[PDB]
Amino acid sequence: MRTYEVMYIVRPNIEEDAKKALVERFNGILATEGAEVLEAKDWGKRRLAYEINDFKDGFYNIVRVKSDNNKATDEFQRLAKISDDIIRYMVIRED
Amino acid sequence: GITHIDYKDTELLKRFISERGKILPRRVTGTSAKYQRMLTTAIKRSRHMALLPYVK
Amino acid sequence: AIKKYKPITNGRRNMTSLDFAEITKTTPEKSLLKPLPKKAGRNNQGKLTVRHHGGGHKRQYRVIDFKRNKDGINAKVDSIQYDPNRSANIALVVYADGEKRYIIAPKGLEVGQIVESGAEADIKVGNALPLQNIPVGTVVHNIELKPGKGGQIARSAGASAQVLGKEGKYVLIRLRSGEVRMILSTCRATIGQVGNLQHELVNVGKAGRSRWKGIRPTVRGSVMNPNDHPHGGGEGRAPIGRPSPMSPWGKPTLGKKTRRGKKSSDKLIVRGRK
Amino acid sequence: NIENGVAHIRSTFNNTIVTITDEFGNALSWSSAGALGFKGSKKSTPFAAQMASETASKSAMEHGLKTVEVTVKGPGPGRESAIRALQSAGLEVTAIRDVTPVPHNGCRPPKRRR
Amino acid sequence: AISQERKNEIIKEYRVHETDTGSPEVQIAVLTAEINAVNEHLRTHKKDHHSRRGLLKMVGRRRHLLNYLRSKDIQRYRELIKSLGIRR
RNA sequence: AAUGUUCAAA
RNA sequence: AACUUGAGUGCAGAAGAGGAAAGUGGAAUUCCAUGUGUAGCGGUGAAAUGCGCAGAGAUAUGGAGGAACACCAGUGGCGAAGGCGACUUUCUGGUCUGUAACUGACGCUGAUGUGCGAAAGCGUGGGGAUCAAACAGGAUUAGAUACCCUGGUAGUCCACGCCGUAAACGAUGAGUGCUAAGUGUUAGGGGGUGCCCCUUAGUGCUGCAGCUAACGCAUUAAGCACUCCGCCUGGGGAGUA
Ligand SMILES: [Mg+2]
Ligand SMILES: [Mg+2]
Ligand SMILES: [Mg+2]
Ligand SMILES: [Mg+2]
Ligand SMILES: [Mg+2]
Ligand SMILES: [Mg+2]
Ligand SMILES: [Mg+2]
Ligand SMILES: [Mg+2]
Ligand SMILES: [Mg+2]
């Protein structure tokens, strides 16, 4: 009942099997109690408008998640920070 | 009459930032008031995911 | 929190004890208690080396581990138990093999699954895993110094160091007291902050509750007649006269850095206390 | 030392500094009003700028570069008379930049004079 | 606080079948539902203060309506207290 | 952007 | 006994820096690290104290740490008042419009009590980047304990607990009806063709009627009526014993 959109960046300096491994794990983290993933969009690499972490480029991912009990995305918000394949991320509600 | 604006909009906000990197006032641009409240809550979370820059 | 005592008796008047709230007191179980004789500061000869120790209450040593074995094998925290040896509390875990052993207690837990040596294990509270696997920014107690020994760093009540960053064979971890020290990259280090936080807020009040701990009373310098302490006896009271304060064995004691020159660690110290 | 340079000038109300460097920040020859004997608030005149850009610019003697590409620190009264007079050593100004550090309400300023 | 349909799970279960609420016996139920909706919230935010006068004001109106129904018959009041547990 | 005090009695 | 206009509850939608609890980011100041470099930077009316060849300030990269969130931003919005302005999430109060389905006067004001209550101050903790009482040094004057400059401790920062005052100010208590008009603006709702006029709620200006000592207030009254509470009775002495 709360349309959680999340979207995140992946570091450019990886190999592509790991790149299609992260999109498999983090869409299984959201798969706990309602995935509802209507788009796993690899809206691809651009030059982001400034510089972060000596990285001039990034790999975006756009994920839509619908849920009710709203426990699910906070597992992502804990577990995405501690790793370092994701330089920035957002979760934003919409109803 | 244009509908509501998210920060997935890549370039729709860029015509309303200045060439240097700051917002335009409503006096300068000439739209309504509510629309630019949606701008000021849109373009900032555009800056948080770096689709639009801080300073040129 | 602490509880405070209403002044009813002129010794009790300001005394504030520690109030045991989160304790789930089992009788401390038989398979780990190891007998500890007291010794009152007298070495293998029998003469007094360090002063100010003496008859406390008869304690009992509870063998806990720090060289955490058992990779990938879980544990359930049953109960939190009081310990008289150290200052932090202690916690009993039970492995899935069926073995019992104690660990020191992190900040918040009453049951749950924590694992050890978990090189692939999520960094929750109390979870323990080798050092280069930790991301930068977290806090950490119970740190090894030479690998495989059993930690000597941040075991007290409340203290927690934190990782500033990495090198590749070392890290740059900054301790509780303000130093910044390189440690070797493959070391166990239990995540979290060690519990029992209000331990220094106690205000023991009576003279006996330092004497029950086993702390015999000291005696100051400038009362002794001058063959036992360099601030010797003078007429009346007396200013200390000598151009610094001094120890009983004739060393200066007020602002004199003493560490043994080199001793093979100064290339690891980056920044001392300030 | 070969034929390059970015110009870092500042101009506060005291001692407008000119310092030209290479593509990195390596200090060919800095110059000031203070190396010249201006002390009684002629530390900052446009005439103090008139011997500012000269004695740094002409003191190249290793590069004598092709352009200057000024970066203007220091909002103060010696701005444009240090960039017109920079040309008097023959260095071909072609693009200017103005970088003064604007806070975003970071630290509270010192108190008002009286 | 209460949602729409949860309020619908509490409004219809007290009032007489008038098919139109807003009675001096249904407002007490939804007010108490709003109280213990919010009074559990004030346990975990003991720093908050702008929420608390919204609590205390509607406690005021509940004490008004439970001191209006006296003037009609007490037999509504007695078992109406006995079902939805208040004091007094 | 100054360095300048005072005026015995209604 | 009943009725419904007062006040409430339902229904649809509409906004908002209303609060409390976690998390993320950018500009900047300062202090450490190393490059290049050498004779001063900083300072005011003018100058000095302070820092500097043992390697400064200007500048290149990098690290650490705390504080506040430029542009939007506006007689703009929200709260009872103090106040609240980066961004996202979790919990949660309040008001506005239209609608008529219920309840049928359930309301107003409040003596004592009960609570919120800027800034400084205090207690036990932590945190300490810029500022910055006391104080220290240099000028200024006859003297300057000051205004000026270079430093700098408390404090300014967070949690828990007190203190409970201010030009806490529209210097204008609270509630409800009524008496010309223009004119901006914000949040809606209907009518007629991105535009033109109807009313509700706030919020700015100009203005008759009326009151006013005069300045001026004037549909947001200081006008015309009612209801309840707080307060004054010449200034000093005194918000003191
Ligand atoms: Mg004696
Ligand atoms: Mg002696
Ligand atoms: Mg004597
Ligand atoms: Mg002596
Ligand atoms: Mg304090
Ligand atoms: Mg000063
Ligand atoms: Mg005010
Ligand atoms: Mg007014
Ligand atoms: Mg009198």
Short mmCIF file of N, CA and C (backbone and C1' of nucleotides) in Angstrom, two decimals, chain G residues 156-213:
data_model
loop_
_atom_site.label_atom_id
_atom_site.label_comp_id
_atom_site.label_asym_id
_atom_site.label_seq_id
_atom_site.Cartn_x
_atom_site.Cartn_y
_atom_site.Cartn_z
P U G 156 25.92 25.87 26.07
"O5'" U G 156 26.03 26.48 24.61
"C5'" U G 156 25.27 27.61 24.24
"C4'" U G 156 25.71 28.16 22.91
"C3'" U G 156 25.56 27.21 21.75
"O3'" U G 156 24.24 27.19 21.25
"C1'" U G 156 27.67 28.27 21.65
P C G 157 23.42 25.83 21.31
"O5'" C G 157 24.45 24.74 20.79
"C5'" C G 157 24.73 24.59 19.41
"C4'" C G 157 25.07 23.17 19.08
"C3'" C G 157 24.27 22.14 19.85
"O3'" C G 157 23.03 21.89 19.21
"C1'" C G 157 26.57 21.57 19.86
P C G 158 21.78 21.35 20.04
"O5'" C G 158 22.10 19.81 20.30
"C5'" C G 158 21.89 18.84 19.29
"C4'" C G 158 22.11 17.45 19.82
"C3'" C G 158 21.27 17.06 21.02
"O3'" C G 158 19.99 16.60 20.65
"C1'" C G 158 23.53 16.46 21.40
P A G 159 18.77 16.68 21.68
"O5'" A G 159 19.08 15.54 22.75
"C5'" A G 159 18.90 14.17 22.42
"C4'" A G 159 19.19 13.28 23.60
"C3'" A G 159 18.47 13.63 24.89
"O3'" A G 159 17.16 13.09 24.94
"C1'" A G 159 20.76 13.22 25.33
P C G 160 16.00 13.83 25.75
"O5'" C G 160 16.37 13.58 27.26
"C5'" C G 160 16.21 12.30 27.84
"C4'" C G 160 16.80 12.28 29.22
"C3'" C G 160 16.26 13.33 30.17
"O3'" C G 160 15.02 12.98 30.76
"C1'" C G 160 18.61 13.33 30.25
P G G 161 13.87 14.08 30.90
"O5'" G G 161 14.34 14.97 32.13
"C5'" G G 161 14.60 14.37 33.38
"C4'" G G 161 15.16 15.35 34.38
"C3'" G G 161 14.52 16.72 34.40
"O3'" G G 161 13.27 16.74 35.06
"C1'" G G 161 16.85 16.96 34.49
P C G 162 12.37 18.06 35.03
"O5'" C G 162 12.82 18.86 36.31
"C5'" C G 162 12.74 20.27 36.33
"C4'" C G 162 13.92 20.89 37.01
"C3'" C G 162 13.85 22.39 37.16
"O3'" C G 162 13.07 22.79 38.27
"C1'" C G 162 15.96 21.80 36.32
P C G 163 11.82 23.77 38.06
"O5'" C G 163 12.51 25.18 37.82
"C5'" C G 163 13.38 25.71 38.79
"C4'" C G 163 14.24 26.80 38.20
"C3'" C G 163 13.50 27.98 37.62
"O3'" C G 163 13.18 28.92 38.62
"C1'" C G 163 15.26 27.31 36.17
P G G 164 11.66 29.38 38.85
"O5'" G G 164 11.19 29.79 37.40
"C5'" G G 164 11.64 30.99 36.80
"C4'" G G 164 10.97 31.23 35.48
"C3'" G G 164 9.47 31.40 35.55
"O3'" G G 164 9.07 32.39 34.63
"C1'" G G 164 9.99 29.63 34.09
P U G 165 7.94 33.43 35.05
"O5'" U G 165 8.08 34.59 33.98
"C5'" U G 165 8.46 35.88 34.40
"C4'" U G 165 9.93 36.11 34.20
"C3'" U G 165 10.30 37.11 33.12
"O3'" U G 165 10.22 38.45 33.58
"C1'" U G 165 11.70 35.20 32.99
P A G 166 9.24 39.52 32.89
"O5'" A G 166 9.81 39.68 31.41
"C5'" A G 166 11.15 40.09 31.22
"C4'" A G 166 11.49 40.49 29.80
"C3'" A G 166 10.36 40.84 28.87
"O3'" A G 166 9.85 42.13 29.11
"C1'" A G 166 11.97 39.53 27.74
P A G 167 8.33 42.48 28.75
"O5'" A G 167 8.38 42.79 27.20
"C5'" A G 167 9.06 43.94 26.73
"C4'" A G 167 8.90 44.10 25.24
"C3'" A G 167 9.88 43.31 24.39
"O3'" A G 167 9.22 42.85 23.23
"C1'" A G 167 10.07 45.62 23.91
P A G 168 9.50 41.37 22.72
"O5'" A G 168 8.23 40.55 23.17
"C5'" A G 168 8.26 39.81 24.38
"C4'" A G 168 7.52 38.50 24.24
"C3'" A G 168 6.06 38.52 24.63
"O3'" A G 168 5.23 39.02 23.61
"C1'" A G 168 7.12 36.64 25.58
P C G 169 3.82 39.69 23.96
"O5'" C G 169 3.60 40.72 22.79
"C5'" C G 169 3.60 40.27 21.45
"C4'" C G 169 3.79 41.41 20.51
"C3'" C G 169 5.11 41.40 19.74
"O3'" C G 169 4.91 41.97 18.46
"C1'" C G 169 4.93 43.39 20.96
P G G 170 4.53 41.07 17.20
"O5'" G G 170 3.43 41.94 16.48
"C5'" G G 170 2.54 42.72 17.26
"C4'" G G 170 2.08 43.96 16.55
"C3'" G G 170 1.72 45.09 17.49
"O3'" G G 170 1.91 46.36 16.87
"C1'" G G 170 -0.24 44.28 16.41
P A G 171 2.41 47.62 17.74
"O5'" A G 171 2.60 47.04 19.20
"C5'" A G 171 1.74 47.44 20.26
"C4'" A G 171 1.97 46.62 21.50
"C3'" A G 171 0.94 46.80 22.59
"O3'" A G 171 0.84 45.61 23.36
"C1'" A G 171 3.02 47.65 23.31
P U G 172 -0.16 44.43 22.93
"O5'" U G 172 -1.55 45.15 22.70
"C5'" U G 172 -2.62 44.94 23.61
"C4'" U G 172 -3.93 45.37 23.02
"C3'" U G 172 -4.61 44.34 22.11
"O3'" U G 172 -6.01 44.55 22.17
"C1'" U G 172 -4.29 46.30 20.93
P G G 173 -6.89 43.88 23.31
"O5'" G G 173 -6.12 42.54 23.62
"C5'" G G 173 -6.57 41.32 23.08
"C4'" G G 173 -6.40 40.21 24.08
"C3'" G G 173 -7.30 39.01 23.88
"O3'" G G 173 -6.78 38.10 22.95
"C1'" G G 173 -7.43 39.72 26.11
P A G 174 -7.57 37.81 21.59
"O5'" A G 174 -8.77 36.89 22.05
"C5'" A G 174 -8.51 35.70 22.77
"C4'" A G 174 -9.77 35.07 23.27
"C3'" A G 174 -10.95 35.13 22.34
"O3'" A G 174 -10.87 34.19 21.29
"C1'" A G 174 -11.65 35.64 24.52
P G G 175 -11.46 34.55 19.84
"O5'" G G 175 -13.02 34.30 19.99
"C5'" G G 175 -13.51 33.06 20.47
"C4'" G G 175 -14.94 33.16 20.91
"C3'" G G 175 -15.88 33.77 19.90
"O3'" G G 175 -16.22 32.87 18.86
"C1'" G G 175 -16.34 34.65 22.03
P U G 176 -16.33 33.40 17.35
"O5'" U G 176 -17.80 33.99 17.29
"C5'" U G 176 -18.88 33.22 17.76
"C4'" U G 176 -20.12 34.04 17.84
"C3'" U G 176 -20.34 34.95 16.66
"O3'" U G 176 -20.82 34.25 15.54
"C1'" U G 176 -20.80 36.12 18.66
P G G 177 -20.91 34.97 14.12
"O5'" G G 177 -22.39 35.53 14.10
"C5'" G G 177 -22.77 36.50 13.16
"C4'" G G 177 -23.80 37.43 13.72
"C3'" G G 177 -23.88 38.76 13.02
"O3'" G G 177 -24.65 38.71 11.84
"C1'" G G 177 -23.77 39.12 15.33
P C G 178 -23.98 39.20 10.47
"O5'" C G 178 -24.30 40.75 10.46
"C5'" C G 178 -25.58 41.23 10.82
"C4'" C G 178 -25.53 42.71 11.10
"C3'" C G 178 -24.85 43.54 10.02
"O3'" C G 178 -25.76 43.92 9.02
"C1'" C G 178 -24.08 44.16 12.19
P U G 179 -25.26 44.61 7.67
"O5'" U G 179 -25.12 46.16 8.03
"C5'" U G 179 -25.06 47.13 7.00
"C4'" U G 179 -24.34 48.38 7.41
"C3'" U G 179 -23.10 48.72 6.61
"O3'" U G 179 -23.40 49.39 5.40
"C1'" U G 179 -22.64 48.96 8.91
P A G 180 -23.21 48.67 3.98
"O5'" A G 180 -21.64 48.72 3.71
"C5'" A G 180 -20.90 49.93 3.83
"C4'" A G 180 -20.87 50.70 2.54
"C3'" A G 180 -20.10 50.09 1.38
"O3'" A G 180 -20.81 49.07 0.70
"C1'" A G 180 -19.60 52.39 1.56
P A G 181 -20.05 47.84 0.00
"O5'" A G 181 -18.84 48.50 -0.80
"C5'" A G 181 -19.00 48.87 -2.16
"C4'" A G 181 -17.97 49.88 -2.62
"C3'" A G 181 -16.80 49.32 -3.40
"O3'" A G 181 -17.13 49.07 -4.75
"C1'" A G 181 -16.02 50.91 -1.82
P G G 182 -16.29 48.02 -5.62
"O5'" G G 182 -15.01 48.85 -6.05
"C5'" G G 182 -13.80 48.19 -6.38
"C4'" G G 182 -12.63 49.12 -6.25
"C3'" G G 182 -11.27 48.48 -6.43
"O3'" G G 182 -10.91 48.34 -7.79
"C1'" G G 182 -11.25 49.83 -4.50
P U G 183 -10.44 46.91 -8.35
"O5'" U G 183 -9.01 46.69 -7.68
"C5'" U G 183 -7.96 47.61 -7.89
"C4'" U G 183 -6.89 47.47 -6.84
"C3'" U G 183 -6.35 46.07 -6.65
"O3'" U G 183 -5.35 45.75 -7.60
"C1'" U G 183 -6.84 47.01 -4.54
P G G 184 -5.70 44.80 -8.84
"O5'" G G 184 -4.64 43.62 -8.73
"C5'" G G 184 -4.63 42.78 -7.59
"C4'" G G 184 -3.35 42.93 -6.82
"C3'" G G 184 -2.70 41.64 -6.37
"O3'" G G 184 -1.92 41.03 -7.38
"C1'" G G 184 -2.82 43.11 -4.55
P U G 185 -2.25 39.55 -7.88
"O5'" U G 185 -1.82 38.62 -6.65
"C5'" U G 185 -0.50 38.66 -6.13
"C4'" U G 185 -0.44 37.99 -4.78
"C3'" U G 185 -0.98 36.57 -4.74
"O3'" U G 185 -0.01 35.63 -5.15
"C1'" U G 185 -1.83 37.82 -2.91
P U G 186 -0.46 34.20 -5.72
"O5'" U G 186 -0.84 33.36 -4.42
"C5'" U G 186 0.16 32.96 -3.49
"C4'" U G 186 -0.44 32.17 -2.36
"C3'" U G 186 -1.35 31.03 -2.74
"O3'" U G 186 -0.63 29.87 -3.12
"C1'" U G 186 -2.32 32.26 -0.98
P A G 187 -1.28 28.81 -4.14
"O5'" A G 187 -2.40 28.07 -3.29
"C5'" A G 187 -2.03 27.20 -2.24
"C4'" A G 187 -3.21 26.76 -1.43
"C3'" A G 187 -4.40 26.21 -2.18
"O3'" A G 187 -4.19 24.89 -2.65
"C1'" A G 187 -5.15 27.65 -0.50
P G G 188 -4.71 24.48 -4.11
"O5'" G G 188 -6.04 25.33 -4.28
"C5'" G G 188 -7.18 24.77 -4.90
"C4'" G G 188 -8.24 24.45 -3.88
"C3'" G G 188 -9.62 24.21 -4.44
"O3'" G G 188 -9.79 22.89 -4.92
"C1'" G G 188 -9.78 25.71 -2.67
P G G 189 -10.51 22.66 -6.32
"O5'" G G 189 -12.00 23.16 -6.09
"C5'" G G 189 -12.85 22.47 -5.20
"C4'" G G 189 -14.17 23.17 -4.98
"C3'" G G 189 -14.97 23.51 -6.22
"O3'" G G 189 -15.60 22.39 -6.80
"C1'" G G 189 -15.03 25.33 -4.75
P G G 190 -15.67 22.28 -8.40
"O5'" G G 190 -17.23 22.16 -8.69
"C5'" G G 190 -17.85 23.02 -9.64
"C4'" G G 190 -18.75 24.01 -8.96
"C3'" G G 190 -19.63 24.83 -9.89
"O3'" G G 190 -20.81 24.13 -10.27
"C1'" G G 190 -18.57 26.27 -8.36
P G G 191 -21.30 24.11 -11.80
"O5'" G G 191 -21.28 25.65 -12.23
"C5'" G G 191 -21.27 26.01 -13.59
"C4'" G G 191 -21.55 27.48 -13.76
"C3'" G G 191 -21.35 28.04 -15.16
"O3'" G G 191 -22.48 27.81 -15.99
"C1'" G G 191 -20.28 29.44 -13.60
P G G 192 -22.32 27.52 -17.57
"O5'" G G 192 -22.40 28.96 -18.24
"C5'" G G 192 -22.10 29.14 -19.62
"C4'" G G 192 -21.19 30.32 -19.84
"C3'" G G 192 -20.05 30.12 -20.83
"O3'" G G 192 -20.42 30.27 -22.18
"C1'" G G 192 -19.19 31.06 -18.86
P U G 193 -19.47 29.68 -23.33
"O5'" U G 193 -18.36 30.80 -23.56
"C5'" U G 193 -17.50 30.73 -24.68
"C4'" U G 193 -16.15 31.33 -24.40
"C3'" U G 193 -15.00 30.72 -25.18
"O3'" U G 193 -14.89 31.23 -26.49
"C1'" U G 193 -14.40 30.87 -22.89
"O5'" G G 194 -5.71 26.59 -17.94
"C5'" G G 194 -5.68 27.98 -18.23
"C4'" G G 194 -4.64 28.30 -19.27
"C3'" G G 194 -4.56 29.75 -19.73
"O3'" G G 194 -3.83 30.57 -18.83
"C1'" G G 194 -4.38 28.26 -21.58
P C G 195 -4.54 31.77 -18.02
"O5'" C G 195 -4.98 32.82 -19.14
"C5'" C G 195 -5.52 34.09 -18.79
"C4'" C G 195 -6.66 34.47 -19.71
"C3'" C G 195 -7.85 35.15 -19.04
"O3'" C G 195 -7.68 36.55 -18.91
"C1'" C G 195 -8.61 33.38 -20.45
P C G 196 -8.33 37.35 -17.67
"O5'" C G 196 -9.90 37.32 -17.95
"C5'" C G 196 -10.58 38.47 -18.45
"C4'" C G 196 -12.08 38.33 -18.34
"C3'" C G 196 -12.67 38.33 -16.94
"O3'" C G 196 -12.89 39.64 -16.46
"C1'" C G 196 -13.64 36.59 -18.25
P C G 197 -13.38 39.91 -14.95
"O5'" C G 197 -14.97 39.84 -15.00
"C5'" C G 197 -15.75 40.24 -13.87
"C4'" C G 197 -16.98 39.39 -13.69
"C3'" C G 197 -17.41 39.16 -12.23
"O3'" C G 197 -18.83 39.04 -12.16
"C1'" C G 197 -16.96 37.08 -13.25
P C G 198 -19.59 39.41 -10.80
"O5'" C G 198 -19.70 38.02 -10.03
"C5'" C G 198 -19.66 37.99 -8.61
"C4'" C G 198 -20.25 36.72 -8.04
"C3'" C G 198 -19.74 36.35 -6.66
"O3'" C G 198 -20.42 37.04 -5.64
"C1'" C G 198 -19.68 34.45 -8.06
P U G 199 -19.62 37.98 -4.61
"O5'" U G 199 -19.40 37.05 -3.33
"C5'" U G 199 -20.51 36.58 -2.58
"C4'" U G 199 -20.31 35.15 -2.14
"C3'" U G 199 -19.19 34.92 -1.14
"O3'" U G 199 -19.61 35.15 0.19
"C1'" U G 199 -19.04 33.34 -2.89
P U G 200 -18.56 35.65 1.30
"O5'" U G 200 -17.83 34.31 1.75
"C5'" U G 200 -18.53 33.33 2.48
"C4'" U G 200 -17.65 32.15 2.78
"C3'" U G 200 -16.36 32.47 3.51
"O3'" U G 200 -16.56 32.55 4.91
"C1'" U G 200 -15.93 31.00 1.70
P A G 201 -15.84 33.69 5.77
"O5'" A G 201 -14.33 33.19 5.89
"C5'" A G 201 -14.00 32.14 6.78
"C4'" A G 201 -12.69 31.51 6.42
"C3'" A G 201 -11.46 32.36 6.61
"O3'" A G 201 -11.02 32.34 7.96
"C1'" A G 201 -11.33 31.16 4.56
P G G 202 -11.10 33.65 8.88
"O5'" G G 202 -9.59 33.91 9.30
"C5'" G G 202 -8.78 34.81 8.57
"C4'" G G 202 -7.59 34.10 7.96
"C3'" G G 202 -6.37 34.96 7.71
"O3'" G G 202 -5.57 35.05 8.87
"C1'" G G 202 -6.81 33.56 5.83
P U G 203 -4.84 36.42 9.24
"O5'" U G 203 -4.08 36.82 7.90
"C5'" U G 203 -2.80 36.30 7.59
"C4'" U G 203 -2.09 37.15 6.57
"C3'" U G 203 -2.11 38.64 6.90
"O3'" U G 203 -0.84 39.24 6.64
"C1'" U G 203 -3.05 38.26 4.75
P G G 204 -0.37 40.47 7.56
"O5'" G G 204 0.10 41.56 6.52
"C5'" G G 204 -0.71 42.69 6.25
"C4'" G G 204 -0.31 43.33 4.95
"C3'" G G 204 -0.89 44.70 4.68
"O3'" G G 204 -0.23 45.71 5.41
"C1'" G G 204 -1.05 43.39 2.74
P C G 205 -1.07 46.91 6.04
"O5'" C G 205 -1.27 47.89 4.80
"C5'" C G 205 -0.14 48.36 4.08
"C4'" C G 205 -0.53 48.92 2.75
"C3'" C G 205 -1.49 50.08 2.78
"O3'" C G 205 -0.83 51.31 3.04
"C1'" C G 205 -2.16 48.53 1.12
P U G 206 -1.59 52.50 3.80
"O5'" U G 206 -2.71 52.98 2.78
"C5'" U G 206 -2.36 53.71 1.62
"C4'" U G 206 -3.55 54.01 0.75
"C3'" U G 206 -4.69 54.79 1.38
"O3'" U G 206 -4.42 56.17 1.46
"C1'" U G 206 -5.54 53.04 0.02
P G G 207 -5.30 57.12 2.42
"O5'" G G 207 -6.66 57.35 1.62
"C5'" G G 207 -7.86 57.65 2.31
"C4'" G G 207 -9.06 57.02 1.66
"C3'" G G 207 -10.32 57.02 2.51
"O3'" G G 207 -11.02 58.25 2.43
"C1'" G G 207 -9.99 54.87 1.59
P C G 208 -10.82 59.38 3.55
"O5'" C G 208 -12.27 59.97 3.75
"C5'" C G 208 -13.21 59.32 4.59
"C4'" C G 208 -14.55 59.19 3.93
"C3'" C G 208 -15.74 59.32 4.86
"O3'" C G 208 -16.10 60.66 5.11
"C1'" C G 208 -16.02 57.40 3.50
P A G 209 -16.53 61.11 6.59
"O5'" A G 209 -17.60 60.02 7.03
"C5'" A G 209 -18.96 60.18 6.67
"C4'" A G 209 -19.80 58.96 6.96
"C3'" A G 209 -20.11 58.67 8.42
"O3'" A G 209 -21.11 59.51 8.95
"C1'" A G 209 -19.53 56.67 7.33
P G G 210 -20.82 60.39 10.25
"O5'" G G 210 -21.20 59.44 11.46
"C5'" G G 210 -20.56 59.58 12.73
"C4'" G G 210 -20.17 58.24 13.28
"C3'" G G 210 -19.14 58.25 14.39
"O3'" G G 210 -19.71 58.50 15.66
"C1'" G G 210 -18.52 56.65 12.79
P C G 211 -19.43 59.89 16.41
"O5'" C G 211 -18.16 59.59 17.32
"C5'" C G 211 -18.31 58.96 18.58
"C4'" C G 211 -17.25 57.92 18.78
"C3'" C G 211 -15.92 58.44 19.29
"O3'" C G 211 -15.90 58.55 20.69
"C1'" C G 211 -15.57 57.00 17.44
P U G 212 -15.38 59.91 21.37
"O5'" U G 212 -13.86 59.99 20.94
"C5'" U G 212 -12.94 59.04 21.44
"C4'" U G 212 -11.55 59.28 20.91
"C3'" U G 212 -11.08 60.71 20.94
"O3'" U G 212 -10.66 61.11 22.22
"C1'" U G 212 -10.51 59.72 18.87
P A G 213 -11.22 62.47 22.86
"O5'" A G 213 -9.95 63.42 22.88
"C5'" A G 213 -9.97 64.67 22.22
"C4'" A G 213 -8.58 65.22 22.12
"C3'" A G 213 -7.81 64.76 20.90
"O3'" A G 213 -7.96 65.65 19.82
"C1'" A G 213 -6.53 64.42 22.87
#
